[PDB]
Structure 1
Amino acid sequence: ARPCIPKSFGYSSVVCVCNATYCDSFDPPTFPALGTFSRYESTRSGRRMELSMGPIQANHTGTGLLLTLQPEQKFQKVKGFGGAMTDAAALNILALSPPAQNLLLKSYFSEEGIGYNIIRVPMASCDFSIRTYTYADTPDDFQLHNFSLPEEDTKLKIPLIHRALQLAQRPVSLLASPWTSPTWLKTNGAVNGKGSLKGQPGDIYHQTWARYFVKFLDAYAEHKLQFWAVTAENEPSAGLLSGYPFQCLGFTPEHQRDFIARDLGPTLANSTHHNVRLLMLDDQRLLLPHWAKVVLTDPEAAKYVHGIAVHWYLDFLAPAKATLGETHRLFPNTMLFASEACVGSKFWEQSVRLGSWDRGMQYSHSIITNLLYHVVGWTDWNLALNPEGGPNWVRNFVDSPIIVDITKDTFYKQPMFYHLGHFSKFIPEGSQRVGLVASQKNDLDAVALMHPDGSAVVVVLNRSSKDVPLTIKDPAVGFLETISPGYSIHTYLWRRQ
Structure 2
Amino acid sequence: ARPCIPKSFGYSSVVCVCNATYCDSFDPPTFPALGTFSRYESTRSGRRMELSMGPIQANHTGTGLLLTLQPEQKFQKVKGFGGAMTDAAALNILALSPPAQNLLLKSYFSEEGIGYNIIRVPMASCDFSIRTYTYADTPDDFQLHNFSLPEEDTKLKIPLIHRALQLAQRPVSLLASPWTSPTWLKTNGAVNGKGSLKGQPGDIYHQTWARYFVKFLDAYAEHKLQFWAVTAENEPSAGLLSGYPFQCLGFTPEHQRDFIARDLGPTLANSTHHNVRLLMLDDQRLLLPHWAKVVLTDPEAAKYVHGIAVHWYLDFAPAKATLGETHRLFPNTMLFASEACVSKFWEQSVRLGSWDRGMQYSHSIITNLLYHVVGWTDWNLALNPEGGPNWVRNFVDSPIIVDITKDTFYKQPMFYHLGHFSKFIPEGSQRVGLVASQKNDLDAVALMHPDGSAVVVVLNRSSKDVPLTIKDPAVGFLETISPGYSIHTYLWHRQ
* 1:283-324, Cα deviation, whole Å (9 max, x unpaired): 0010000101101011110110000000011784x3111111
Paired with 2:427 and 2:315, the residues of 1 have a C-alpha distance of 28
Name 2:470's counterpart in structure 1.
472
Preserved contact between residue 284 and residue 315 of structure 2 (Cα < 8 Å):
no
Give 1:231 deviation, angstroms: 0.1
Give 1:219 deviation, angstroms: 0.4
Name 2:118's counterpart in structure 1.
118
* 1:48-89, Cα deviation, whole Å (9 max, x unpaired): 000000001111111111101011110000000000000000
Preserved contact between residue 147 and residue 215 of structure 2 (Cα < 8 Å):
yes
Deviates more, 1:438-447 or 1:57-66: 57-66
Paired with 2:344 and 2:57, the residues of 1 have a C-alpha distance of 48
Preserved contact between residue 82 and residue 116 of structure 2 (Cα < 8 Å):
yes
Preserved contact between residue 422 and residue 491 of structure 1 (Cα < 8 Å):
yes
Give 1:189 deviation, angstroms: 0.3
Preserved contact between residue 285 and residue 315 of structure 2 (Cα < 8 Å):
no
Paired with 1:496 and 1:91, the residues of 2 have a C-alpha distance of 45
Give 1:35 deviation, angstroms: 1.1
Give 1:329 deviation, angstroms: 1.0
Paired with 1:324 and 1:174, the residues of 2 have a C-alpha distance of 23
Paired with 1:57 and 1:71, the residues of 2 have a C-alpha distance of 18
SS at match of 2:156: helix
* 1:425-459, Cα deviation, whole Å (9 max, x unpaired): 00000000001010011110000000000010000
Paired with 1:21 and 1:218, the residues of 2 have a C-alpha distance of 38
Preserved contact between residue 347 and residue 396 of structure 1 (Cα < 8 Å):
no
Paired with 2:299 and 2:158, the residues of 1 have a C-alpha distance of 36
SS at match of 2:382: coil
SS at match of 1:397: coil
Paired with 2:272 and 2:78, the residues of 1 have a C-alpha distance of 26
Preserved contact between residue 165 and residue 172 of structure 2 (Cα < 8 Å):
yes
Name 1:226's counterpart in structure 2.
226
Change (3 A) 1:66 1:346: closer
Preserved contact between residue 21 and residue 99 of structure 2 (Cα < 8 Å):
yes
* 1:456-492, Cα deviation, whole Å (9 max, x unpaired): 0000000000000010011011110000000000000
* 1:371-402, Cα deviation, whole Å (9 max, x unpaired): 00000000000000000000000000000000
Paired with 1:121 and 1:46, the residues of 2 have a C-alpha distance of 33
* 1:19-61, Cα deviation, whole Å (9 max, x unpaired): 0111000000000111110000000000000000000111111
Give 1:260 deviation, angstroms: 0.2
Give 1:348 deviation, angstroms: 4.4
Asked if 1:85 is matched to 2:81, the reply is no
Paired with 1:205 and 1:314, the residues of 2 have a C-alpha distance of 31
Preserved contact between residue 454 and residue 495 of structure 1 (Cα < 8 Å):
yes
Preserved contact between residue 314 and residue 362 of structure 1 (Cα < 8 Å):
no
Alignment size in residue pairs: 495
Name 2:322's counterpart in structure 1.
323
SS at match of 2:90: helix
Preserved contact between residue 366 and residue 445 of structure 2 (Cα < 8 Å):
yes
Q: CA RMSD in A?
A: 0.8
SS at match of 1:313: coil
* 1:318-372, Cα deviation, whole Å (9 max, x unpaired): 31111111111111111000000000x5554310000100000000000000000
Large movers: runs of 4+ above 4 Å: 345-348
SS at match of 1:237: helix
Paired with 2:35 and 2:171, the residues of 1 have a C-alpha distance of 31
SS at match of 2:463: coil
SS at match of 1:58: coil
Preserved contact between residue 100 and residue 409 of structure 1 (Cα < 8 Å):
yes
Paired with 2:255 and 2:387, the residues of 1 have a C-alpha distance of 34
Preserved contact between residue 20 and residue 99 of structure 2 (Cα < 8 Å):
yes
The alignment-based identity, stated in percent, is 100
Unaligned runs of 5+ in 2: none
Paired with 2:272 and 2:73, the residues of 1 have a C-alpha distance of 38
Name 2:167's counterpart in structure 1.
167
Name 1:192's counterpart in structure 2.
192
Paired with 2:53 and 2:327, the residues of 1 have a C-alpha distance of 37
Preserved contact between residue 295 and residue 301 of structure 2 (Cα < 8 Å):
yes
Preserved contact between residue 356 and residue 414 of structure 1 (Cα < 8 Å):
yes
Paired with 1:308 and 1:179, the residues of 2 have a C-alpha distance of 17
Preserved contact between residue 286 and residue 315 of structure 2 (Cα < 8 Å):
no
Paired with 1:476 and 1:353, the residues of 2 have a C-alpha distance of 44
Name 1:46's counterpart in structure 2.
46
Preserved contact between residue 315 and residue 346 of structure 1 (Cα < 8 Å):
no
Paired with 2:278 and 2:26, the residues of 1 have a C-alpha distance of 36
Paired with 1:250 and 1:167, the residues of 2 have a C-alpha distance of 38
Preserved contact between residue 125 and residue 179 of structure 2 (Cα < 8 Å):
yes
Match of 2:347 among 322, 346, 349: 349
Unaligned runs of 5+ in 1: none
Preserved contact between residue 39 and residue 51 of structure 2 (Cα < 8 Å):
yes
Paired with 1:477 and 1:5, the residues of 2 have a C-alpha distance of 37
Change (3 A) 1:346 1:214: farther
SS at match of 2:230: strand
* 1:260-293, Cα deviation, whole Å (9 max, x unpaired): 0000000000001110000000000100001011
Name 2:4's counterpart in structure 1.
4
* 1:190-228, Cα deviation, whole Å (9 max, x unpaired): 000110100000000000000000000000000000000
Please give the TM-score of this superposition, normalised by the length of structure 2: 0.99
* 1:222-259, Cα deviation, whole Å (9 max, x unpaired): 00000000000000000000001000000000000000
Change (3 A) 1:219 1:347: farther
Paired with 2:331 and 2:36, the residues of 1 have a C-alpha distance of 37
Match of 1:434 among 428, 432, 435: 432
SS at match of 1:120: strand
Paired with 2:443 and 2:314, the residues of 1 have a C-alpha distance of 16
Paired with 1:314 and 1:361, the residues of 2 have a C-alpha distance of 17
Match of 2:407 among 403, 406, 409: 409
Paired with 1:206 and 1:479, the residues of 2 have a C-alpha distance of 59
Paired with 2:64 and 2:440, the residues of 1 have a C-alpha distance of 11
Preserved contact between residue 284 and residue 314 of structure 2 (Cα < 8 Å):
no
Name 2:259's counterpart in structure 1.
259
